[PDB]
Each structure stands twice: as structure tokens, then as C-alpha cells.
Design a protein around this ligand. Structure first.
Ligand SMILES: *[C@@H]1O[C@H](CO)[C@@H](O[C@@H]2O[C@H](CO)[C@@H](O)[C@H](O)[C@H]2NC(C)=O)[C@H](O)[C@H]1NC(C)=O
Ligand code: NAG
Ligand code: NAG
Ligand code: NAG
Lengths: 49, 48, 292, 98
């Protein structure tokens, strides 16, 4: 008779990243709170968050 | 002699026969249905 | 000329001969020199007939060291110093270990791979540092006369090979480590169906995988930046820079893996008549018979 | 939007947990297929090796970089039943070989 086949679920995905993380939590947890007049700006690019 | 004949036929599933790859799951995951039949036809005509 | 952006107009000396000296040794693959492990695959107690990009046995290298001085030149940025990246190259760099101020520092030249070396294209730069290897492939802005300086006992110049305000749209950025107290280094760079590969070794005959990146473009140019320093001259220490390069081609090899997964022997299938029989039967000890 | 090289990892890292005993698909390091996993003690992996292959070219194991564990991939069952049926019977006799 015909072959019995099933459709599995819950696939697995794995891949090694090639770009470093953005690391925003450490920058937002800085002990130095800037004044509203300063509002220091830092730009994040080509990273993972 | 029987073992060599069965192992040679088993390796035919890893050949490309001109296609982009040998696994049908990779073809059906990186190409659209309209342009995917041209790649599967090369694997069917080669394995048969 | 490398880039299309004027960056400096400092002193320039006369265009000397700068002959690309040829090495006296040949490539020997009887122990593993020239072969590399697979990307992320492990083979145990088996023999594999790999069809990859390996250097041809019995061939000489060509030096590309461009150790500069207080002056520079315009012929260094011209062929044959800028070869054609047809299929790949094989590097063999000497670990220039200095002992300035009783400190063991390891510095040597870099390698740049690109297609047109402009902003709308991707340029792969592998610049070594003190005990840390850096690899970035972004859309840098190449200068007309790029060069690098030395950290320990710096020159009277400043390293300036790219000028940008913000970081461009990069595709790969990662650091690697290497042994500082080493003797020789080996590398592997080649392309296949668009994607790019890279290897590196510090000890042993084979090399280890670094990364695999997809670009979609066919890069066919590579150039080695000079090393402007004032510590490897005649009056200074007798250390000399070396950077050997030999072309690669698609050829079949036979690798042997022991019970642990270390390459023990390797033979080139297009070297002699005996090696042709080994790659046909896939064994280092062929049987008795007549082979065509 | 929908450009650049700054993405988020809120899709591929959904569960980050694998089972051992059931058949499920996998996309480990660009390799696609199906199989069954099984925990095993392996000490032949290096700092740059993550997959295990045989001479024929099939993956028979891997190593996860998030938990530092080694497994073994085995092909999942896909067989065929041989049934014998009489002339004017109502249900054939089934036989699952091996
Ligand atoms: C890889 O290594 C390089 C070299 O150490 C790192 O670049 C340093 O970054 C810090 C922080 O921005 C600077 O203070 C240093 O001046 C940089 N060094 C050099 C030589 O430029 C880099 O951050 C490391 N990581 C990555 C992802 O590249
Ligand atoms: C390696 O393979 C040989 C040849 O089949 C065999 O005799 C030997 O027992 C194997 N060793 C191990 C550790 O599997
Ligand atoms: C680095 O090389 C030195 C000698 O070349 C050796 O003694 C040392 O063990 C090596 N270290 C590593 C981490 O390989
Ligand atoms: C796995 O082992 C390596 C080397 O021992 C270690 O650097 C890494 O942190 C380990 N992974 C985890 C998740 O602990």
C-alpha cells in the first residue's frame, strides 16, 4: 500500500550572528543623568537590539 | 556487488543535475512557485 | 591609485624598482600545509575527497611587503602590486615580534579586498592589532594613498586610509584573537557562487574557519597596504616584513582524518601518477591492479 | 524602514528550546531537513566546529552554542505496509516488516 507520511511541526532555527548587539541597556543605566539642557545624543547603527 | 549498487543509487539524491541545490526544501524556501518548477523538473528528470 | 578621494599630499620620494622577490621554497602538502578544515563540519576516522580551492603543489610565492619610511611613493599603489583576485589567494605572514621597551608586541601589514574601492561598494579590511585581529567589511571610503602606522615606536606620520563622519551600512563586524608569541601565520581567502570565505591559523598546518558572508558581487581586486614605521630599518632592529601570496584554483584533494578529527595526510590528485590512483580508489594504500 | 542593516532578534529567538524524542524540522546553520534528536556526551568539537558529517555528506549531529550541549540527528521513520487481501473478503491482513 501507499507510504504513510506525517507533517511535523515546531521547527528549530539556529544561526550565528555577524553583527554585535546595540547594548542600549547599559547606556540607559548610566549613573550620570544629563540635564534637560544637555540631552547628550548617541547614534546606534548596524547592530542588533 | 549488491552493496555497491545500492550505495551508488543512494548518492544520486545529493546531485544537482544543473539545479541550484539538491534538497527540495531549499528550493521551495528561496524561490517563488512560478520559477520553482524549472528547478524541480531538473531533479525529477535526473533521478528517474 | 586605490580610492577616488584625495586625503593627503605629504612628501613623496622617487619611484624605486621594488622587485617582487620570489621565495625559494615550494608548497608541500604531505603534512597539511595548504589544506584547510571544512567550514563547520567534523570528520572522524574517515577519508574525504574534497573538491575545493587549494594551492597547486610545487610552486613558489611572491613577496608583497611595502615597509615604508618618512617618505612615500606613487608606484607602490600601481600594478603588479595590485593583482587580480581571480579565484583566491593563500597568505603566509611572518609574526614580526618586537622587543621595544622590554615589551613583546606583534604587528604586521594588512590586506584589503574590493571591487572598485568606492563608497557604493563593499570593501573587506583585515587589520591586525596588538594581540587581537579585527575583520570588518563595510562601505569604507578608500584614499588615493592608503597606509598604516605602527603602534610601538610610531612613525612621523599618521594612519589615514578612510575618512567618514558616521559608520556606513556595514555587513560584518567581529574580532578574533591570536597568539602573540608566534612564528608564522596562514590565511585563506576565496569566493564561490558570490559568497566569500576566510580562514586563519597561528599554530599547525591546517587553518580554522573565520566567517562566511554573502555579497552578490564578483570582487576581482586585492591590495596590501604599506606599513610606515621607523623601527625595521637598517640602523634599527633587523626585523623584516614578509607577506607571501600564491594563486588558488579548483582542484581535488584527499584528506585523512584520525579518530579525533585532525588532518594527518593530504595528497594532490594532479601531482604524480601514484596520486591519481589514490584519488580514484579513495585510499592511501591502493590494492594491486591495472588502472586507466 | 525596511532598509539598512539594523534589525531585531524578536523572531528567530522565540523558544530557544529543543526536544529529544519527536521528529521536527530544523534550519541549523543554513542546513534544512528533518530528524530526531538525542542527547549524547561528545568531546570532539572545537571552537569553530558546530556540525558533524559522514563520508557520504549527511549531518549526523550538531552542537548548540547557547547551551553547550551535543546531540545526534537520526533519520525519522518513513516505511511501507504490505497487506494481503483475499478474493471476497472485507479487510486485508496488515504486516509491518521489521
Ligand atoms: C574590536 O577591536 C577593536 C580594536 O581594539 C575595537 O576598537 C576599539 O574601540 C574602542 C571603543 O570604541 C576605542 O576606544 C578604541 O580606540 C578602538 N581601537 C582601535 C584600534 O580603533 C572594537 O571596538 C572591537 N570590537 C568590534 C566589534 O570591532
Ligand atoms: C576506525 O576505522 C577502522 C577501519 O574501519 C577500524 O578498524 C577502527 O576500529 C576505527 N576506529 C574507531 C575508534 O572507530
Ligand atoms: C603561544 O605560543 C607559545 C610559543 O610559540 C606557546 O608557548 C604558548 O603555549 C602559545 N599559547 C597559545 C594560547 O597557543
Ligand atoms: C560554552 O563553553 C565556552 C568555552 O568553555 C564558554 O566560553 C561559553 O560561555 C560556554 N557557554 C555557555 C552558555 O556557558
Amino acid at each position: 500500500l501507499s507510504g504513510f507520511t506525517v507533517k511535523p511541526v515546531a521547527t528549530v532555527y539556529r544561526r550565528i550572528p555577524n553583527l554585535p548587539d546595540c547594548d542600549i541597556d547599559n547606556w540607559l543605566n548610566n549613573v550620570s543623568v544629563p540635564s534637560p539642557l544637555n540631552w547628550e545624543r548617541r547614534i546606534f547603527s548596524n547592530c542588533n537590539f | 556487488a549488491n552493496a555497491q549498487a545500492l550505495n551508488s543509487l543512494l548518492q544520486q539524491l545529493f546531485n544537482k543535475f544543473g539545479a541550484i541545490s539538491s534538497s527540495l526544501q531549499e528550493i521551495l524556501s528561496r524561490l517563488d512557485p512560478p520559477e520553482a518548477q524549472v528547478q524541480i523538473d531538473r531533479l525529477i528528470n535526473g533521478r528517474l | 591609485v586605490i580610492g577616488d578621494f584625495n586625503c593627503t599630499n605629504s612628501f613623496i620620494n622617487d619611484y624605486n624598482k621594488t622587485i617582487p622577490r620570489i621565495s625559494e621554497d615550494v608548497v608541500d602538502v604531505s603534512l597539511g600545509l595548504g589544506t584547510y578544515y571544512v567550514l563547520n563540519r567534523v570528520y572522524l576516522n574517515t577519508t574525504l575527497l574534497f573538491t575545493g580551492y587549494f594551492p597547486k603543489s610545487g610552486a613558489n610565492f611572491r613577496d608583497l611587503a611595502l615597509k615604508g619610511s618618512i617618505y612615500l611613493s606613487t608606484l607602490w599603489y600601481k600594478p603588479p602590486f595590485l593583482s587580480d583576485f581571480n579565484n583566491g589567494i593563500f597568505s603566509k605572514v611572518k609574526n614580526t615580534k618586537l622587543y621595544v621597551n622590554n615589551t613583546l608586541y606583534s604587528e604586521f601589514s594588512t590586506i584589503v579586498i574590493g571591487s572598485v574601492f568606492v563608497n557604493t561598494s563593499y570593501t573587506i579590511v583585515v587589520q591586525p592589532h596588538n594581540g587581537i585581529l579585527e575583520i570588518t567589511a563595510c562601505q569604507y571610503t578608500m584614499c588615493e594613498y592608503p597606509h598604516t602606522v605602527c603602534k610601538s615606536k610610531g612613525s612621523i606620520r599618521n594612519e589615514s586610509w578612510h575618512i567618514d563622519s558616521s559608520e556606513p551600512l556595514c555587513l560584518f563586524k567581529k574580532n578574533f584573537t591570536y597568539n602573540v608569541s608566534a612564528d608564522w601565520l596562514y590565511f585563506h581567502f576565496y569566493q564561490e557562487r558570490g559568497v566569500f570565505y576566510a580562514y586563519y591559523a597561528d599554530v599547525g598546518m591546517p587553518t580554522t574557519f573565520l566567517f562566511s558572508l554573502y555579497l552578490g558581487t564578483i570582487l576581482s581586486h586585492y591590495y596590501v597596504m604599506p606599513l610606515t614605521c621607523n623601527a625595521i630599518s637598517s640602523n634599527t632592529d633587523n626585523e623584516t616584513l614578509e607577506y607571501w601570496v600564491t594563486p588558488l584554483s579548483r582542484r581535488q584533494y584527499l584528506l585523512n582524518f584520525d579518530e579525533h578529527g585532525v588532518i594527518t595526510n593530504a595528497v594532490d590528485c594532479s601531482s604524480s601518477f601514484l596520486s591519481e590512483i589514490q584519488c580514484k580508489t579513495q585510499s592511501f594504500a591502493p590494492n594491486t591492479g591495472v588502472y586507466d | 524602514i525596511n532598509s539598512g542593516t539594523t534589525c531585531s532578534n524578536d523572531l528567530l529567538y522565540s523558544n530557544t528550546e529543543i526536544s529529544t524524542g519527536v521528529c521536527v524540522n530544523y534550519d541549523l546553520y543554513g542546513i534544512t531537513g528533518q530528524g530526531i534528536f538525542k542527547e549524547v556526551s561528545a568531546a570532539y568539537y572545537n571552537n569553530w566546529q558546530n556540525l558533524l558529517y559522514d563520508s557520504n555528506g549527511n549531518i549526523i549531529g550538531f552542537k548548540d552554542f547557547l547551551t553547550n550541549k551535543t546531540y545526534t540527528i537520526l533519520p525519522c521513520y518513513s516505511g511501507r505496509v504490505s497487506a494481503a487481501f483475499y478474493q471476497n473478503s472485507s479487510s486485508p491482513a496488515l504486516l509491518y516488516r521489521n
